[PDB]
Design a protein around this ligand. Structure first.
Ligand SMILES: [Cl-]
Ligand SMILES: [Mg+2]
Lengths: 357, 356
């Protein structure tokens, strides 16, 4: 019976990326062919069958997107239609029912309006993290798709991921670990993929690597992605007489096993249609990694994680000399995404879904 | 929702379905310890909307059976094997786990409390026991949960074969894997089963009730079925009356395979009880057509005789009718059940008796 955090007392500057109990979440339940009307729920728990399919047989997928208080005082969700469609794709891959795009967008507006006082104010660099979830809740023993599903959407304010500037990190390649089967569910944002990566995480954390890069499980010769973020590389950077970048190539792996990052898609669209440079979505052999001039990971919580080095066995590929250093194009991407998200750069590609609050 | 009245259950008509009994047993882990076991009558619990099990998949389970035996006692079949595998599955997903003794304490408690749901001797039914460990701490970052819950629930299930073994047709899923080469295929974890459902629906649409996987790494070696191990029987030799006196039990070896306790039981029966040959090794798919019998094995079925295996356009036929069944397969089925129900002496002390 725990109480909501008082929004008027939240020190936004101390926020990191943690669970925080806001006023409400929204809920809908599927049975007999239809979702029930969306409802606000104040208590951050629900009653689940001890036999729920989500707990025994893994029918559980989720999403992640951000809502922002913009420079002119409005509220916008960043590309939520992309999340609604990926949620449907994750559900389908696990034989789960899913809310339609419109039900998803209705849930978002409903939950954002009821928790509007939890959106970190403009100037904090914070945001409202949105976590949609679909889980099989029917009680069953045989291994089969559940007959009942629940769609939840919860929110929590998070602080600026980079309080005080972009920082680069060291990555390790997991040679004795896979994150996805070649013909598996690596492209679905499903619960099981994350627990299946925890053992590799602890091995990498014990060696002081905050991020783990995976190669393709089939041959272990091509870059796949990090455990919770896509991989990209930058090369062929060319500049004019003023030092301005006038050309470069953004490279990112292509594979049915890779989670299709919406931030990655955003970066590709910025590289080619906003800045007018080259984008390559193709197989990235690991031997090519040493030819990249910049390397990064991409995902909603970080936008980008600049990669200072990649370690595989005893071979080290060094991109940046210090964690203070970050790739120039990588930083440009970060600032351009954030400029659009917060309303400072005009939203040329209509990525911002404004919510009337 | 109310518990099913045990005096109204038609034991012989039961299949393998969820049924609400009197109670389950629960313990929660926090701050370094599991809480004292408690019986809970209501078959739901309050779970955080941000629970690690729901978002990041820290959820593993077990399955074993409890039997009312011929002399009136109650026994669980090899429950220490389940306790040790539960710990192994938990370790693989960086989850806390109950100790063997806590698991056995939980088992005796839930079995005694639900004794009226154990199908009586003569029914061929049993009490299926479903242990479960789940991450229950609320968290946003991907990391092992700080809180876990241990549940053990039960349901009566009927005789899987009411009226003799029945064989089935299997299909090899060439465009689907069940486990990565360096993944969690050897852990009995929730995510493995949802990840198999798409392949399952494709096979059912073609009228195949069981799906066989080859190794994800090369697709040339037998791995296992989606929820049961594979074995083959060959080199069958008989005495002058046709009694089987020699054979070879072959089952695939791989770090991706869930180590089936029923498979382990069959290997121990073949070698230590009957004195025949057991080979735990890789089985290239080209060898499958040389098996005289083929089977799937797991707790719910004991064995499923495999009548045929279809891969692409190639069909391997083992049995001509769903009525016809391989003799070694049937012997193994009857010997396991004979031990489970107390009719065959429990030479290897596999039966864990529970005071009820
Ligand atoms: Cl313990
Ligand atoms: Mg322990």
């Amino acid at each position: 019976g725990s109480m909501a955090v008082d929004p008027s007392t939240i020190d936004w500057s101390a926020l990191k990326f943690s669970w925080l109990q806001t006023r409400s979440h929204v809920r809908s339940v599927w049975r007999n062919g239809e979702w029930s009307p969306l409802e606000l729920v104040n208590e951050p728990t629900f009653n689940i069958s001890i036999a729920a399919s989500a707990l025994h047989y893994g029918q559980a997928v989720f999403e992640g997107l951000k809502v922002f208080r913009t420079v002119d005082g409005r509220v916008a969700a960043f590309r939520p239609v992309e999340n609604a469609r990926r949620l449907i794709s994750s559900c389908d891959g696990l034989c789960m029912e899913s809310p339609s795009e419109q039900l998803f967008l209705n849930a978002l507006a409903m939950v954002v309006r009821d928790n509007v006082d939890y959106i970190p104010p403009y100037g904090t660099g914070g945001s409202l993290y949105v976590r949609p979830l679909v889980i099989g809740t029917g009680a069953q023993l045989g291994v089969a798709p559940s007959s009942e599903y629940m769609f939840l959407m919860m929110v929590a304010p998070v602080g600026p991921y980079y309080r005080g500037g972009l920082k680069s990190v060291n990555a390790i390649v997991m040679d004795e670990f896979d994150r996805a089967a070649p013909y598996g569910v690596g492209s679905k944002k499903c619960a099981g993929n994350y627990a299946a990566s925890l053992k590799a995480q602890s091995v990498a954390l014990k060696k002081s690597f905050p991020i783990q890069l995976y190669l393709d499980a089939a041959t272990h010769t091509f870059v796949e992605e990090f455990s919770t973020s896509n991989f990209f590389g930058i090369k062929d950077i060319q500049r004019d007489g003023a030092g301005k970048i006038v050309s470069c190539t953004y490279v990112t792996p292509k594979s049915p096993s890779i989670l299709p990052s919406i931030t990655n898609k955003t970066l590709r669209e910025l590289i080619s249609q906003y800045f007018g440079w080259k984008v390559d979505v193709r197989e990235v052999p690991f031997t090519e990694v040493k030819t990249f001039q910049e390397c990064g990971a991409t995902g909603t919580a970080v936008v980008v994680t600049p990669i200072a080095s990649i370690t595989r066995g005893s071979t080290v590929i060094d991109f940046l000399q210090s964690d203070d250093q970050v790739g120039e194009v990588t930083k440009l991407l970060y600032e351009t995404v954030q400029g659009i998200q917060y309303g400072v750069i005009p939203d040329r590609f209509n990525w911002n879904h404004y919510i009337d609050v």
